[PDB]
């Protein structure tokens, strides 16, 4: 991440351009006129649950939706997977630069600690447990903010 | 036999606040035949007949889609009518949205300086566009423009330049004559096709 | 959640009181003097990755640490599991009231959408796909904030 | 035989900024024997001898643990010394931290009103405590107090009341005589044991 001066747009164009390749197929296929992706979802993306809502959708599309469509109609199974790539490619760039997708970011301190814990083993179960009060003091400290 | 053929196809063709519906006539169309145009706003299962009879192959639907840039788009359908019979409806293949709008510029002004030629791009301000919806307001970020520059006297050749501002400068390295310019707009994040502007020239002399 | 006027303290006392029941065992057992839970972890709890860091630790303790200790020495396998309960009991109360643990909260709009999608089935794959641009417009909208 | 027995046990006993180390003497201790007290700040593998010889069973370690409330605690050890021989070290069973501090009040003031008796709780301000570290500063939230009230003349009986403020009121329903009071402090989130204050009385007459 380079603060992302603004390299993201080129990635959305990449995403849409990928979508145009399958736009007509599905838009000719979908004959219903009710909105599925309600604007309630939009408000959520703006609520302080935004990150979580966004991660879930990307997951939803990549895991449930796209897999079921790519398979069901190989006709576009490729054109669709391509879109999928552009998507994952976006998600990756979104979380490499904090602010956008913090909710998919691992904690560094937590990483080192888990490792230091693994580098101890037997002595590790004992020290993590006997530091529990420090744990509580951290948790408590957290809440007080 | 008593059947009346449906329009072979219906598609939108639009620029900023100039949403024109288009369609192909039925085969061997008599002159007493016309087309009924209907509309639908995505999210509301409701078709609204806009024109009961139009003897043409296009129809300006702007006025009934003035909230396109703050919506999820529309669907339009057309059917043939002659006497008391009418064809099946022919609907657009895709939902018309801001993605199917061709970007264009309002105009281009040119001034001559020392070795610089100042250029200013006037984004389109159509009438039908409500104030709240200015081009800049809708496409707030990533607006770019490709520029083509032709020298006159000279042949039909162009130098290409890429800018990211409505204003730019042109190096008059140490030449005279007229300088014609045309600009094509775009949005870095959008894939919307654009159109080259009417050339705009300026006599340096 | 009742805005949590302040019902949390009683829960931390519950946690510590549970810990005191095993404090001496492990503190007599742990003979090393280096800190395992570095204050870097504390800073993380204060960084804008706080929620994620806190969730991971609670997970770490409940999944890795406590299970390995409770089992290894049944002597306190109970006294420890009890602590575990007080912990889960805390986590639960923390995420029922937003602000503290948003990162463990599901999106409502995303829930309804997933269901409306399931209530469609065949027609669902098609409508989710043909609304992809709305998806992108939501994602894009998000970023622009 | 040439062995010198180690202290049977070493434990802390402390109040706000009054951290006293304690230990049990070795069996059949001659008077030329004394104890060496050492210290360790959790996180730093380093034992620091505080006193090379103390002929007593306790030791005020406050001064060398003035940063207890902004730390992860300490470990203390004691060993017996007589002539040129010394016992193995005996370390505290648990890390001494703010969790092992007994809460207490500084004092209690009482004023008499109409049917109310105004009570104000003075939290402890020990000397050794640096300014930055006031009781309120360390235990900023969830400070509570149990109150016991005795009537005099009268028997040794008390009415119990629970407050969450350093100040409280007592209903003098319509009686006379002296009113003695004692308070025990606590922190809603902490499990720290507390101590009843020296009784404080007030002659209503």
UniProtKB/Swiss-Prot annotation, chains A, C:
Positions annotated as glycosylated: 105
Keyword Transport on entry: no
Mutagenesis / variant outcome for changing residue 13 to A: About 80% loss of IL10RA binding
Gene Ontology cellular-component annotations: extracellular region; extracellular space
Acetylation recorded as keyword: no
Subunit structure: Homodimer. Interacts with IL10RA and IL10RB.
Record's function text: Major immune regulatory cytokine that acts on many cells of the immune system where it has profound anti-inflammatory functions, limiting excessive tissue disruption caused by inflammation. Mechanistically, IL10 binds to its heterotetrameric receptor comprising IL10RA and IL10RB leading to JAK1 and STAT2-mediated phosphorylation of STAT3. In turn, STAT3 translocates to the nucleus where it drives expression of anti-inflammatory mediators.
Record protein name field: Interleukin-10
Biological source species: Homo sapiens
Annotated gene: IL10
Swiss-Prot record, chains B, D:
Domain of life: Eukaryota
Tissue: Primarily expressed in hematopoetic cells including B-cells, T-cells, NK cells, monocytes and macrophages. Not expressed in non-hematopoetic cells such as fibroblasts or endothelial cells.
Location(s) in or outside the cell: Cell membrane; Cytoplasm
Family: Belongs to the type II cytokine receptor family.
Disulfide bond positions: 34-53, 180-201
Binding partners and assembly: Interacts with IL10. Interacts with IL10RB. Interacts (via its cytoplasmic domain) with JAK1 (via N-terminus). Interacts with BTRC; this interaction leads to IL10RA ubiquitination and subsequent degradation. Interacts with STAT3. (Microbial infection) Interacts with human cytomegalovirus protein IL10.
Residue ranges that the UniProt entry lists as topological domain Extracellular: 1-205
Role: Cell surface receptor for the cytokine IL10 that participates in IL10-mediated anti-inflammatory functions, limiting excessive tissue disruption caused by inflammation. Upon binding to IL10, induces a conformational change in IL10RB, allowing IL10RB to bind IL10 as well. In turn, the heterotetrameric assembly complex, composed of two subunits of IL10RA and IL10RB, activates the kinases JAK1 and TYK2 that are constitutively associated with IL10RA and IL10RB respectively.
Disease: Inflammatory bowel disease 28, autosomal recessive: A chronic, relapsing inflammation of the gastrointestinal tract with a complex etiology. It is subdivided into Crohn disease and ulcerative colitis phenotypes. Crohn disease may affect any part of the gastrointestinal tract from the mouth to the anus, but most frequently it involves the terminal ileum and colon. Bowel inflammation is transmural and discontinuous; it may contain granulomas or be associated with intestinal or perianal fistulas.
Official protein name in the record: Interleukin-10 receptor subunit alpha
Entry PTM: Phosphorylated. Phosphorylation of the cytoplasmic tail induced STAT3 activation.
Entry-listed glycosylation sites: 28, 52, 88, 132, 155, 167
